[PDB]
A = this chain, B = another copy of it.
Amino acid sequence: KIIINLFAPNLPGSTKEDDLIQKSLRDQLVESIRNSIAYRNVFFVDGTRGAGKTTFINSVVKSLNSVNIKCLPTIDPTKLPRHEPILVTVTARLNKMVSDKLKGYWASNDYRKQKEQWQNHLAQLQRGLHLLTDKEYKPEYFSDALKLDAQLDYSIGGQDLSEIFEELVKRACEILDCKAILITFDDIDTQFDAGWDVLESIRKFFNSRKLVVVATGDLRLYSQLIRGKQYENYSKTLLEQEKESVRLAERGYMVEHLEQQYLLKLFPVQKRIQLKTMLQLVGEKGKAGKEEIKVKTEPGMQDIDAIDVRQAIGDAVREGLNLREGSDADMYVNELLKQPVRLLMQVLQDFYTKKYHATSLSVPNLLRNALYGSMLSSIYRAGLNYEQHRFGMDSLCKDIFTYVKQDRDFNTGFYLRPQSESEALRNCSIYLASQVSENCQGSLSKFLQMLLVGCGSVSIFNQFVTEDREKFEQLISEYVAYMSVGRIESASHWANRCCAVVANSPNDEKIGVFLGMVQLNRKSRQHMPGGYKKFNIDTENGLAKAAMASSLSTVASNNLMDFCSVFNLIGAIADISACRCERSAITNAFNKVIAQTTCIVPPWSEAQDDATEFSDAITKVEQWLKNVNEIEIGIRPSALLIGKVWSRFYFNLNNVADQHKTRLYRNAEHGRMASQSNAAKIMRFNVLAFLHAVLVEESLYHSVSDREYIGEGLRLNPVTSVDEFEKKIKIIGEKLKADNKTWKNTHPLFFLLISCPILHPFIFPVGGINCSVKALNKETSFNKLIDEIVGDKLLSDEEWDYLTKNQQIFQNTITSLNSSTIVGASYDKDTPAR
């Protein structure tokens, strides 16, 4: 039972016996040292850099001084002169107390003998010490060497101070009547240039069984030190001559075995003791740990209700990062606890103390601050914007794009999962994930941007870009230069830019159809039968032309080549929710790509009254937006939440890129069957994908729901109908009516995504409705449920007959988009009927 209070000073020296993290690890060496002196006596303590290292040395020295051992108070070579040998450091410390003991006798019988014996020993030390501190061996020092000191009858000849040192230790044993003398060297991790002298002093003079030595540090730096010091034993002329592949390997093998032998002779394995981080002490998800340690976050509450570190980390991250209780949130706790002990300690206390200060609210901001300063060293390697004035949406997507650059992954790259092979990149991900939940919290327009640039730009950069390893980085610089990724720009400009990117890849039989792309003819081809004709914009009605303007894009290549990029619908719905007032976002989003947007091919390519009626469409789109203010707050998006929804949408995007690609038919007018394909029906399946994309996985990662409304079974995408999708809606229907949960709060994005008047005309194209006996059964249920959700009736009464049976004035349906043609099919195969 170990109790931790976060409002304690948290000093390295404030960790008392009660707060000692490793209670058993402190005493595990005590049994050895008591038995070691009783029967190379080099003790080492292993621990992660800055992970309970300080609390270990302080706890051990207090325990021993509390069998009789004088523990020399800790001496740290880092905070010591570099030139001064460590033998000088220890001898000064030993001489201190032993002659301190000889202060009050004042010519006692033992005093004169004991003081003389220690002073004589120091004479041998000093007369041998200068030999250690010699630039070169001078002849006058051989006079000391030739003249053998006839005192104390040492065995090893000459002025070797190795044997001279131990008779000093036994003198401190005699004067201070202690069975052993303990020395506790501190870390040399910060500066081991003078620590090399520490290692040599250990292996050269500390040989007597009566002195026990304790050292600390991390094995990796000592391994690098020895290899660096063993390399110095190689002459530079040799290291600069033999540049053979074998010669380097044989020398490489040599130094590798040098450090293994040196360490295994320096630090015996059985004497080595390693430090247990709390992750081991808490163990796996549910497995009971060796010891339980709790942290308290408030001074008002007692220690009775102490909560686990796994719970405290779990509670903080869960709603701090807006993560639902699940696999993703429970596995973030593992990542935090495997950091250095102090680092995760400093992060958690920083948030909890700031939580206490803030309460006296943008919760993700508070947790962002805790991880920002503590975990800032990884930012510079990752190139993240450490400046606090650039925390925008355009820069963050660039940083998300930048995070992908160092990870070289695109499937799991945009999930922002902090599990990369590099800890620095792994750490960079969580802060990047944390930043997403901060700026995008309580927003829907910014959510749609992350679908395009936050998670769609990385997706499109994989399929329609990559189609010499340094070329990968070279095209990246081309992408940041020409494509202007991360530069602030309208999603309409991005969509037309993205439309060109998707249009780069050509398809078979030269048909202009791609993933979510729809082609409109620009040339008046000869011998053109039927109602199919060149694309025209004036014929659409008020809402239709405005909706068409929300899905219109034109490239500026050598030949003008029109398209119906679906990303414009995403772009039109993204920027529209940023303002939601003043009737301003309409005035520029509908007309920016057609006229005042510059769209070109990439360098790597190788190519009535008009005003009055149109006012109703302008007013109608924004009237519903009177409620978004109170509903958009309820969204608490996370990086995984944005990543998960887009990944499914891209799966739902290409449902028509191939299945309705070759199925182009001459009689596709008023397409009644799933086999029949036209531009209107193709876009219907795409617009149905956008509304339904978030549906399935939003119930899985949203904190307001602890259950699943989708159900158990198989879930596919709407490909040629909504037979699957409508059944899922009805399943939710009995799972939203049984519970007293309105669909305007439990699924706010779903509530506020399908009610948009921008996409309303596209949903039921007159030429794109599946009029068949098997499909229309589910179509009626689909349309009755959806019109129930929007509240006010969407479609009028007359259009039901015309839509289901087969140029009436409709203001809620795209009309002429079916007449627009696709070039290259030639319509050779007619519609098969069976």
Q: Is A301's CB within 8 Å of the partner chain B? A: no
B residues less than 8 Å from A256 (CB atoms) = 377-378, 381, 424
Binds B, one of A128-136, A626-634, A761-769: A128-136
Residues 408-446 of chain A, each 1 if its beta carbon lies under 8 Å from chain B, else 0: 111110000101111110000000000000000000000
B residues less than 8 Å from A478 (CB atoms) = 408, 469
B residues less than 8 Å from A12 (CB atoms) = 40, 265
Q: Which of A301-352 contact B (CB under 8 A)?
A: 331, 340, 342-343, 346-347, 349-350
Q: Which residue of B lies closest to A278 (CB)?
A: B389
B residues less than 8 Å from A241 (CB atoms) = 227, 231, 239, 255
Q: Is A773's CB within 8 Å of the partner chain B? A: no
B residues less than 8 Å from A191 (CB atoms) = 233
- Cβ contact within 8 Å between A675 and B524: yes
- Cβ contact within 8 Å between B713 and A515: no
- Cβ contact within 8 Å between B261 and A340: yes
Residue from B103, B484, B549 within 8 A of A411 (CB atoms): B484
B residues less than 8 Å from A395 (CB atoms) = none
Q: Is A711's CB within 8 Å of the partner chain B? A: yes
Residues 211-253 of chain A, each 1 if its beta carbon lies under 8 Å from chain B, else 0: 0000000011101100111111111111111000000000101
- Cβ contact within 8 Å between B239 and A239: no
- Cβ contact within 8 Å between A595 and B716: yes
- Cβ contact within 8 Å between A155 and B73: yes
Residues 587-601 of chain A, each 1 if its beta carbon lies under 8 Å from chain B, else 0: 110010011111111
Binds B, one of A556-564, A748-756, A786-794, A801-809: A556-564
Q: Which of A491-527 contact B (CB under 8 A)?
A: 497, 505, 507, 514-515, 522-524, 526-527
- Can you tell how many copies of this chain the complex includes? 3
B residues less than 8 Å from A470 (CB atoms) = 469
Q: Is A290's CB within 8 Å of the partner chain B? A: no
B residues less than 8 Å from A9 (CB atoms) = 36, 39
Q: Which of A107-161 contact B (CB under 8 A)?
A: 122, 126, 129-133, 136-137, 139, 142-143, 145-146, 148-150, 154-160
- Cβ contact within 8 Å between A158 and B234: no
Question: Nearest chain B CB to A257's CB is how many angstroms away?
Answer: 6
Q: Is A659's CB within 8 Å of the partner chain B? A: yes
Q: Is A96's CB within 8 Å of the partner chain B? A: yes
User: What are 21 sample pairs from A and B whose C-beta atoms fall under 8 A apart?
Assistant: A75-B156, A84-B131, A95-B148, A133-B139, A190-B262, A229-B235, A231-B235, A253-B423, A264-B374, A280-B389, A409-B482, A410-B603, A411-B497, A421-B486, A556-B653, A588-B700, A591-B715, A595-B697, A595-B715, A600-B650, A611-B711
- Cβ contact within 8 Å between B279 and A349: no
Q: Is A94's CB within 8 Å of the partner chain B? A: yes
- Cβ contact within 8 Å between B94 and A832: no
B residues less than 8 Å from A30 (CB atoms) = none
Residue from B96, B389, B469 within 8 A of A279 (CB atoms): B389
- Cβ contact within 8 Å between B657 and A274: no
Q: Is A24's CB within 8 Å of the partner chain B? A: no
Q: Is A89's CB within 8 Å of the partner chain B? A: yes
- Cβ contact within 8 Å between B137 and A84: yes
Q: Which residue of B lies closest to A731 (CB)?
A: B610
- Cβ contact within 8 Å between B231 and A238: yes
Residue in A237, A343, A424, A829 whose Cβ sees the most chain B Cβ within 10 Å: A237
Q: Is A407's CB within 8 Å of the partner chain B? A: yes
- Cβ contact within 8 Å between B657 and A145: no
- Cβ contact within 8 Å between A132 and B81: yes
- Cβ contact within 8 Å between B587 and A712: yes
